[PDB]
């Protein structure tokens, strides 16, 4: 916006989530974002090395 | 071990938690009271004399 400023928005990168009808806790909700997000993520680098 | 077992059991164990999270529980039973209608009180012979 301005000089010496810079801004970094936050950007979407998954987009993997379900929201627990039940209502019962909110660390349901977190884990199975983190769970399914895993799951893609080791997927990807099963037998490699960077 | 053979790990593509274990990321399916957990995939399968995690689909299994999800689906029994979404089941919701609504009725929309309706009531006993009984709608009235109109109604006329009817009239009994009767034999006046004098």
Same mark, same amino acid.
Request: proline content about 8%; overall charge negative; aromatic content about 2%.
């Given at each position: 916006?301005?000089?010496?400023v810079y801004i970094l928005?936050?950007?979407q990168a998954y987009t993997?989530?379900?929201?627990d009808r039940r209502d019962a806790s909110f660390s349901n909700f977190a884990y199975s974002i983190a769970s399914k997000l895993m799951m893609e993520?080791?997927?990807?680098?099963h037998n490699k090395i960077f | 071990p053979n790990? /593509? =077992?274990?990321?399916?059991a957990l995939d399968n164990v995690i689909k299994q938690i /999800? =689906?029994?999270?979404v089941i919701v529980?609504?009725?929309e039973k309706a009531d006993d009271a009984q709608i009235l209608g109109?109604?006329?009180?009817?009239?009994?012979?009767?034999?006046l004399f004098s």
């Open positions: 916006p301005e000089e010496n928005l936050p950007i993997g989530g379900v929201i993520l080791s997927a990807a680098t | 790990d /593509e =077992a274990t990321i399916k /999800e =689906a029994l999270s529980n609504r009725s109109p109604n006329t009180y009817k009239q009994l012979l009767e034999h």
